[PDB]
Each structure stands twice: as C-alpha cells, then as structure tokens.
Paper text:
Consequently, trypanosomatids possess multiple biopterin and folate transporters with salvage pathways to convert them into the reduced cofactors 5,6,7,8-tetrahydrobiopterin (H4B) and 5,6,7,8-tetrahydrofolate (H4F) by means of [name] ([name], EC 1.5.1.33) and the bifunctional, nicotinamide adenine dinucleotide phosphate (NADPH)-dependent enzyme dihydrofolate reductase–thymidylate synthase (DHFR-TS, ECs 1.5.1.4 and 2.1.1.45, respectively)., [name], a broad-specificity, short-chain dehydrogenase, can reduce dihydrofolate (H2F) to H4F, thereby circumventing inhibition of DHFR-TS.
We have shown, using cocrystallization studies, that an example small molecule identified using the screening assay described here binds to TbPTR1 through interactions within the pterin binding pocket in a manner similar to that observed for MTX.
Author numbering:
A (entry chain C), B (entry chain A), C (entry chain D): 2 to 103, 113 to 142, 152 to 268
D (entry chain B): 2 to 103, 113 to 142, 153 to 268
The structure:
Amino acid sequence: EAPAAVVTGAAKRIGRAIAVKLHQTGYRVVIHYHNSAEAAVSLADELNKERSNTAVVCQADLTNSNVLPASCEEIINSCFRAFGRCDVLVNNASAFYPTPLVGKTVETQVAELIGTNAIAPFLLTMSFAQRQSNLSIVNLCDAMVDQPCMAFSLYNMGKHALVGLTQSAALELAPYGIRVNGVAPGVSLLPVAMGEEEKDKWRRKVPLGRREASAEQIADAVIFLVSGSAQYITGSIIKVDGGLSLVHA
Amino acid sequence: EAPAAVVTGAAKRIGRAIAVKLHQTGYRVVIHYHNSAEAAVSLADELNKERSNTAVVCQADLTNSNVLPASCEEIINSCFRAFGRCDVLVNNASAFYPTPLVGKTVETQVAELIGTNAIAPFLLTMSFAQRQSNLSIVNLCDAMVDQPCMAFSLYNMGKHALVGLTQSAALELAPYGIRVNGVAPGVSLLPVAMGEEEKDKWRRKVPLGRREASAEQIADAVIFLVSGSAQYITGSIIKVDGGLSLVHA
Amino acid sequence: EAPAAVVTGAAKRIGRAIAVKLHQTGYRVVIHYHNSAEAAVSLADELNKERSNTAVVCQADLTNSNVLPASCEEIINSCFRAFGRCDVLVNNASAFYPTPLVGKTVETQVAELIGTNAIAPFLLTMSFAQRQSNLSIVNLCDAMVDQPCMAFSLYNMGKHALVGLTQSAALELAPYGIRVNGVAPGVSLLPVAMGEEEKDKWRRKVPLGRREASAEQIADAVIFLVSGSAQYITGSIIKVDGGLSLVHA
Amino acid sequence: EAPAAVVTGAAKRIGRAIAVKLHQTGYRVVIHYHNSAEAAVSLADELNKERSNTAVVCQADLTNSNVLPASCEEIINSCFRAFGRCDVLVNNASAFYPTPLVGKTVETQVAELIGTNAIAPFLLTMSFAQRQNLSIVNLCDAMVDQPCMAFSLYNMGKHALVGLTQSAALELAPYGIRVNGVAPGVSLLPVAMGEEEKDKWRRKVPLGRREASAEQIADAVIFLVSGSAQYITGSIIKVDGGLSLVHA
Ligand SMILES: NC(=O)c1ccc[n+]([C@@H]2O[C@H](COP(=O)([O-])OP(=O)(O)OC[C@H]3O[C@@H](n4cnc5c(N)ncnc54)[C@H](OP(=O)(O)O)[C@@H]3O)[C@@H](O)[C@H]2O)c1
Ligand SMILES: NC(=O)c1ccc[n+]([C@@H]2O[C@H](COP(=O)([O-])OP(=O)(O)OC[C@H]3O[C@@H](n4cnc5c(N)ncnc54)[C@H](OP(=O)(O)O)[C@@H]3O)[C@@H](O)[C@H]2O)c1
Ligand SMILES: NC(=O)c1ccc[n+]([C@@H]2O[C@H](COP(=O)([O-])OP(=O)(O)OC[C@H]3O[C@@H](n4cnc5c(N)ncnc54)[C@H](OP(=O)(O)O)[C@@H]3O)[C@@H](O)[C@H]2O)c1
Ligand SMILES: NC(=O)c1ccc[n+]([C@@H]2O[C@H](COP(=O)([O-])OP(=O)(O)OC[C@H]3O[C@@H](n4cnc5c(N)ncnc54)[C@H](OP(=O)(O)O)[C@@H]3O)[C@@H](O)[C@H]2O)c1
Ligand SMILES: Cc1ccc(-c2ccc3nc(N)nc(N)c3c2)cc1
Ligand SMILES: Cc1ccc(-c2ccc3nc(N)nc(N)c3c2)cc1
Ligand SMILES: Cc1ccc(-c2ccc3nc(N)nc(N)c3c2)cc1
Ligand SMILES: Cc1ccc(-c2ccc3nc(N)nc(N)c3c2)cc1
C-alpha cells in the first residue's frame, strides 16, 4: 500500500510544492498549516480529486510553548489516524524575520523563530520515531547559514540548531532504519513584501542562471532524499542554491 | 582604569579558570553563578584579597523563560554597577545532559539546554552591546558538534545555535568594534560522577598527549581572543581539542 | 540523440557501477581505464550488447606529469570522436595508499596521489569545458576528509583539493550552464588486500545498517546529480556514508 | 639556548612580519626566499644587528619537481646547520595568480601553485618531522569556500593545505609536534593594485573596513607556536575581520 508523509507548513510556496511532488510520487500526505486553512484545504481538495482519501489537513501552532510537545505528537498522530502509517516527515514550517541585536517581545521572537526552526522539528522527530520500509526525515535548512543576513541572529541560530538536530537524529535513529537529512535552499521563492528591484539585486547574485530556485527544484531534492535512491544517505544536507553560497562579498 | 569582564558560570571548573586568568591579566571580574553560591563567594574573596574591589558575584538562572531577557540585562547592569564599564563577556555557563529521542519534562529540558547554551548568550550579547577600547565576547562552544555524543540532541542543537550566534553577532557588532569569537574544547574537565575507567577510555582517544585539556589551557585561548593580539579576529572559533575531532570512528 | 558521459577508472568497482547506471539511464559511455584493460573491454562488450555503439574504452595514465594535460584533452576528445558530444564527466579514478611523514619515491607518490585525485580532475574539467542541454561534472570525493586515515596525508591532500576544485569550477562554469558537484562515500567497496576481521571492524562503525555502501548506492547519487532533478544544484557534495562521518572516536 | 624557526617566503610582506615577530619573541630564524635575495639579506642583517648570529638566509624554488624533496630537506638541514635545532616551521611562501578553466603552460602553473601552497609544505613537514615546544604553522586562506573567480589551481592548493594541516596534526601528535593554520581574509594588498580597487575590498571587511596588517597575521602565528597553545593542534584560526561571513 501507499506510504504516508507529513509536511509542515505545506499550504503555500515551498511546503506546497513538496506535498504536491510527494503526492505525485505516490504518497498519502498530511498538509500541516497554522494560519493558512483555506489554502491547506484547497490543496487537499486538489490532491483528493486526483486520488480519493490521499490528503488530509492538520492545524497547529509550532511556536515554542508548554503545549508544543502535545501539538507535535498530534501532528504525527494525525498521519497514523488518517493513513495507519507515517513514513516521511518533512520539517518545512519556519518563521523568518529580523531580530536586531542593538512589536513582538524578544521572548516571543525566541519562541517563534527557535520554535518553528528547531524545537518543533526536534519534538516532531521524537514523536515520529516513538510511533515506529523506507522511513526518513527531511529538514528544510538554509545554504546561507555561514554568511547570514544582517540582523537575523535568532533565525540563524534556529537554522544552525536544525543542522545539529539533523546530525544528532541521523546518528541516534540510524539503528531504527530512520534516515535524517536536509535540503538547504539559497534563494528560492522571494518575499511577497519585497520590491521588484530588490528581487533582481538578489537574482543577479546567483551564478547558475541568475535566478532564484523554483519551489519545485527544492522539492526535487526532498524527493531524492526520501527515495530508494538515497537508502545509504543519512546526516547529509544537500545545498540547492545555484552556487550562491560560493560567491564572495 | 582596569577593564572589566563578565564570566557566566564562573564559580568552578572552566568558568573559574577563565575568570582567574582574566583577573591575572588585570581585569576586574563579575563571577556569575546559578547554584554554586559558596564557591562563587569564595573565588571572589580570593581575587579581592589579591587586588581590593576587583571582583563581585552575580546570581542568575539562565534557563529560558519570559524573564530571561531581564536577567541577562541585569547581569550586564551588575558589571557597570560594580566597575563602571563592561569590556568583555564570556558565555561559559551551560547545561549538559542527555535527551534521548526514543524526571524533567521535555519543556524544562528545552528551556535549560537551549536557554543556557544559546538563548542567554544571545540576550547577554544584546545587553552587552546595548550598554556600549578593546571590546569582545567569547562563546564557549564544542569541538565535537559535528560528531555528537549519542542521545544529546538538545545539547547539540544549543551548541550549534551558539556557533550561529558567534557568526551573526560578529557580523552585526563589527561596526561597533565589538569582536565575537568562540573557543571550542574537545575533552577538558571530565564529569565529576564519571568513573576512572570511562575517563581513561576518552583520554586514550586524544592524539596530543592522550589526556584532556586542563582548564587553564582552555582559558589561554579565551585570553588570546580578548587580547590586542587578536584585534583583527572576529567570527572565529578556535578548537582547543588536542586533535580529538580529527580522529575517525 | 542520446547524451554521452566520461567516467574515469570505470573498468571495476564504483567506477564500473557508475558507468553501468549512466548507460541504463540512456547515456553513451567512455570507459576510461589505466591498467584494467581486459575488464574495460569486457564492460564495453556488455554495454554494446545491450545497445550497439553506446560504449568505447579509453586508456590513460592519470599520474601527474607534463603530458597529463594532453592525456586529459585526449580523454575528452575520445568522447567527441565516439559520440559527437560530451555531456557528463565523472572524476572517479583515484590512487589510494599510505604515505607516512616519518618502493615508490616520494616524487612518484606525489604524482600519483595528487595527479589522480586532483590535477587530472582539474585538467579534465578544463578540457570538458573548452569543448563546450544538461551538462555536468561529478567528482568522487570522500566523506572522511576531515577525519582522515592515519598516514594518508597525500591522499587526503588530493581529496581536499578535489573539494576546492568542485567549488571553484562550480562558480566559474555556472555562466556556461555546466554544474559541478561531488559524491562523498564513507566506507564502500572494501580494499582487495584487506582481511575479514578488519572488514567487519569497519562495518560495525556504520550507524545505518552496520555495513558498507554498495557501488550501486554510490552510483545512485551520481545519477541524481546529473539528472534534471538536480538542475539548480551546483557546488554541492552529497555524503553517501550511512552516517559514518558523524561518529566520534 | 634559543629555539629556531624556518619561515618560507620570509623576505617580504607577511612572511617578513612573521620572521620579525618570531625573532622579537627570541627565536633564531631561517629566512627562506626564492627571488627576493636583497630583501632577505636586508632582513637578516637587521635581525643580526639586533642579536648577533640569530638569522641566516636560505634560497630555494618551491615549485613542484623531481628535485623539490631534496630542496625541502636542504631547507630543514640549513636550520640545523646554523642553529643545531629546528623548533618551528612556518609554511608561508605561496604562488598566487589566476588559472582560468576556459605565457606559462598549464603544467607549470600546476607545478608552481600546487608545489608552493601544498607539496612543498608537505615535503617540509616530512623533513621537519624526520629530524625530530615543536610546531608547524601553515598559512591558509579564510576565503577558500568563497573562492575568487578563475583561481581554481590556487584554491586547490590551499584546500590541499587544510588537508595537510589536519593529516599532519593527527600523525605527528605522538611526537609532540602540533600542526596548525592561520587563515587571512584580505591582508597586504598587491603593490600594483589601484587605491580605488583596494578600497572597494577594504569596504567589504566588517571589522574596521580595512585589510589585516602583516603584523596581525603574525600575532596569530605567535600565539600558535607559544606555550599558550600547547593543547591546540589541527586548528585553523581565521584572521579575517569577519570577511568570510559576508554574503554576496
Ligand atoms: N524561500 C527561500 O528563498 C528560502 C531560503 C532558504 C531557506 N528556506 C527554507 O525553506 C523552507 C520553506 O521556505 P518558504 O519560503 O516556503 O517558507 P515560508 O513561506 O516563510 O513559511 C512556510 C510556512 O511556515 C509556516 N509557519 C510559520 N510560522 C509558523 C508557526 N508559528 N507555526 C506553524 N507554522 C508556521 C506558515 O504556515 P501558515 O501559512 O499555514 O501559517 C508558512 O506558510 C523554510 O524552512 C525556509 O527556512 C527558504
Ligand atoms: N568540560 C568539557 O570537557 C567541555 C567540553 C566541551 C565543551 N565545553 C564547554 O565549556 C564550557 C565550560 O565547561 P564546564 O565543563 O566547566 O561546564 P559545567 O561545569 O558543566 O557548567 C558550568 C556552569 O554552568 C552553569 N549553569 C548550568 N545550568 C545553568 C542554568 N540553568 N543557569 C545558569 N547557569 C547554569 C553552572 O553554574 P552553577 O554551578 O553556579 O549552578 C555550572 O557551574 C561550557 O560552555 C561547555 O559546554 C566543556
Ligand atoms: N570505500 C571506498 O571504496 C571509498 C571511500 C571513500 C571515497 N571513495 C572514492 O570513490 C571513488 C571510487 O572508489 P574505488 O574504491 O572504486 O576506487 P579504486 O578501485 O581504488 O580505483 C579506481 C580506479 O582508479 C584508477 N586509477 C588508479 N590510479 C590511476 C592512474 N594513475 N591513472 C589512471 N587511473 C588510475 C584504477 O584504474 P585501473 O584499474 O584501470 O588501473 C582503478 O581501478 C574514488 O575516487 C575514491 O577515492 C571510495
Ligand atoms: N595577502 C593576502 O591578503 C593573503 C590573503 C589570504 C592568504 N594569504 C596567505 O598568506 C601567506 C602570505 O601572503 P603574502 O601576500 O605575503 O604572499 P606573497 O607576497 O604573494 O608571496 C610570499 C612569497 O612567496 C614566495 N614564493 C612565490 N613563489 C615561490 C616559489 N616558486 N618558490 C619559493 N617561494 C615562492 C615569494 O618569495 P620571493 O619574493 O623571495 O620570490 C614571495 O615573496 C601566503 O601563504 C598567502 O596565500 C595572504
Ligand atoms: C533574496 C531573498 C530570497 C528569499 C528569501 C526568503 C523568503 C522567505 C523565507 N522564509 C523562511 N521561513 N526562511 C527563509 N530563509 C526565507 C527566505 C529572502 C530573501
Ligand atoms: C569524556 C567527556 C569529557 C568531558 C565531558 C563534559 C563534561 C561537562 C560538560 N559540561 C558542559 N556544559 N558541556 C560539555 N560539553 C561538557 C562535557 C563529558 C565527557
Ligand atoms: C574500511 C575501508 C573501506 C574502504 C576503503 C577504500 C578502498 C579503496 C579506495 N580507493 C580509493 N581510490 N579511495 C579510497 N578512499 C578507497 C577506500 C578502505 C578502507
Ligand atoms: C583584493 C586582493 C586581496 C588580497 C590579495 C592577495 C595578494 C597576494 C597574495 N599572495 C598569496 N600568496 N596568496 C594570496 N591569497 C594573496 C592574495 C590580492 C587582491
């Protein structure tokens, strides 16, 4: 029968492309969302039109809190509930915004940026492993972590922690046959609130084609890592950045 | 005027070694502690008998919470209260224990391991910089972050986030003339509860001398980074590991 | 028209598996070899029986010398002579043997280890680019490059230069639409001369499955990197090591 | 008696500052050079004026060839002949020029860039070790993962040097020989480069919008050879003003 995958923040943009490609590959999917209910259900409707009862949605805030472990457990449980199995976890949901060192309170920013990018991946990783073939986890990382955007220290700390989790969980879960890997975009789908001139500044920086990655190109790397063609691969983070991280200042 | 330094978790072990060496170099010191009140007071007494009014203690829990920003702000405030300046911050205090993926609640484990190793350094860094010559911050990292101990994922995530901080904060605070660097021990002071046979198993693995780093050897690298001999150094992490991280399985 | 690929050191082992999978994928192939003449011709025979006129052999020594540039030129030329095009270069051929610091002269050891692992890849890369779809190069690197085997300094130097080449050529050849990537094995096909107790000692070290990578599992990663599913990927090295590089001493 | 150090390419620029600082720390020095005889001799005279019989020059081409192993052995031998001991080796000499992928022949560019940056350090390390606070410091490059366009052989040479630093650290540790690296970002700029282009680069550096002095590079070499770094091996210290942290 068909394997099942959980994709966090799967309603729009990159998580959406990932869930679509996984479904096209033959997976049943849990579309996790926080604020984007309409979009999440729209995607489920589309996927279920293709193959009946192969997509469900699951709401959760992934901000760090007292209830986050229970929320993460429920995300995994919804996959087992809907499909009787959970073969793939994709940690894609992510808050992204500046937190200058020199109005959300700083402790809220910690909760959101560190929660979404690191603690929730950790808790979902725990629950995914506890509840257990070709099982794997794919973490959406960031190819630019060592050359970070100015004033994004919390966001960067979140993504660095996710690298640590990817590595630690690969080592620890290997005995269980659970592989744990990452995909590290450089520039992909650009901010909605970014202006067109600024977009082109960034595009011009990419050696391979002077363009951002499509969400589908990011999804392609996820598809590889979950597949039978990556069965010896664990603890690896694959850059999908058109060479951007190689470009000096 | 003598410069002043804050060392977190400075009552014993490596934090103490760093405070002492800074003091011997001519720094006035804030000895931060959490539980080790007797040892912190004792160390301060010792340093003050060497030079009068050159050391004060400062108690704070560095577990993550909504009050952690205020606590970190107060730690920096206490350096200015005592000495009228704050030249150096050393982020040494650190929780370290296993958190298996498959007692304390996971919420507490997250708060302690991520708070001490990452969030408190980030908040102390904000406060140190907000309050502002040879200014710098040294973060105590871990040379083994890419070959972590089994079942230490939250601890590892915390140390990886600290690397991210070191880099982000080096970039962002360079315009202010604040350098931000790391020292990464491999095996130094062994756990107090560890049996001699287990200690020797680890000692035997170290290429350079088959022994752990002394606390002073760790302090030596910290003292270099804060000195005028490191005035162009920022965003660097110096391994003090005797070659351990180079040794394959 | 079918695309064409050069695989160096393709007569046996991992190189052979790569040549076989490329061919199965629809590529015409140049089977480069040095001494394994019989095995190279035998492979070409096998592949040509499957689809006629889709495989040729090409002999060359890839040791560093003044004629190495011309030899590398001729390898690329042989691909054009046979197939009219050259879409993919796989830098697989590699000398591997200890060279302690404390019958071959050191001059020969340098020429062999640095020539095969670094200079030949570099010269092949020049020639490939100069003769110029989905064009790409895949370099066979080494996951253990930062945790090297004792007394393998020249080999390790070679593999390190190979990473540098992958990055530098990714950046420079991007404007030409040539992607440059790496696949980094941990332990795969074991040395011929190695005895069985020693083989099993190394197998025990691999977290994922306690065994070495098949040559086909290595080839699988090469296949991905050259595919249309990796079209935004350049300057990336994918570890295929079962988590081995994550294991501390 | 005083310890002794060999510094390669020590006649000028960064290697010169390294030799001067080592000398000021109390080392006797072998000032190796290739083409800069007048500058090397001028340095030796300055140092010997300071302390009699504490500096000698040693000429050698560090390009890769059949004779390079013998030349490197002779450089180490020179330190023993002058001073009776060799405590420190600094691998500083380096060829640096573009080699685009698309009058020197490429085999000569390989020989010069790979020989000076990698093979010569390896042979020198062998010779240094066969003869034995002992340490080796290799001059690396902080920008090796964000390389300059069309510098592939140079970049290959420096990556090879990181491999050597790690491999030799591991292998010579049982002998009490530590092996480390100093990785400048931008330090002393080419003499020929117009100020307009120098300042373009200077402005990229987060920490003070300037290049490293040769003396600041030397300071990190001085730390690594000192008693203060006695547990440090296989480490490479960036001295780059934050440059490698700056995205495109
Ligand atoms: N886009 C890029 O150029 C780029 C570059 C580097 C790395 N990446 C990584 O790739 C991944 C996807 O990128 P993206 O641009 O598609 O992401 P995105 O648009 O910024 O966000 C993806 C989703 O994250 C979910 N999310 C945010 N905060 C949440 C919270 N507190 N709780 C639960 N869910 C939350 C949101 O779901 P709802 O809409 O349902 O609220 C959002 O739609 C991220 O991990 C990102 O860091 C992207
Ligand atoms: N020891 C090693 O071999 C080694 C290896 C790698 C890295 N390191 C790094 O080097 C640094 C020092 O090592 P160490 O072994 O000396 O450290 P440690 O003894 O394990 O901890 C140092 C201090 O951290 C403080 N701390 C713990 N939890 C705290 C909390 N919730 N709030 C405030 N303070 C808290 C404690 O202060 P109180 O005693 O006052 O409660 C403790 O004395 C650490 O950052 C460590 O990660 C050490
Ligand atoms: N566990 C592993 O096997 C492992 C681990 C890490 C990395 N890797 C990397 O993966 C690749 C394949 O591994 P492998 O074990 O299959 O390699 P290998 O069998 O040791 O060597 C591959 C071929 O390289 C060719 N070669 C050697 N010296 C040459 C020279 N001077 N000139 C021209 N060709 C020469 C030989 O060709 P002829 O037989 O025709 O003479 C040989 O068959 C290598 O790059 C290796 O470094 C392998
Ligand atoms: N300058 C920078 O911004 C920078 C940046 C990153 C890394 N670094 C590293 O720091 C080190 C010092 O840099 P630098 O700018 O001072 O170096 P440099 O001036 O470019 O070269 C130093 C010396 O290397 C010697 N050399 C060149 N080719 C040689 C050969 N074939 N055989 C023997 N010696 C040869 C030359 O000696 P003669 O003059 O006697 O012929 C030259 O003076 C180098 O390893 C370099 O890669 C420097
Ligand atoms: C030029 C440029 C391209 C893409 C983004 C960008 C947009 C959204 C976004 N979301 C996120 N959770 N994480 C990111 N790293 C991210 C990055 C920003 C700037
Ligand atoms: C063999 C061995 C050597 C040293 C430690 C060790 C002891 C205490 C300790 N505290 C800490 N905050 N962080 C560490 N990384 C740490 C590590 C553990 C095991
Ligand atoms: C345990 C163990 C597994 C595999 C090899 C091994 C065998 C052949 C081999 N060839 C080569 N060109 N490069 C390597 N790194 C290599 C490695 C050595 C030791
Ligand atoms: C802008 C700019 C910055 C630094 C150099 C520079 C000058 C000389 C130089 N020599 C050398 N052996 N290695 C280098 N990496 C180097 C670099 C050149 C141009």
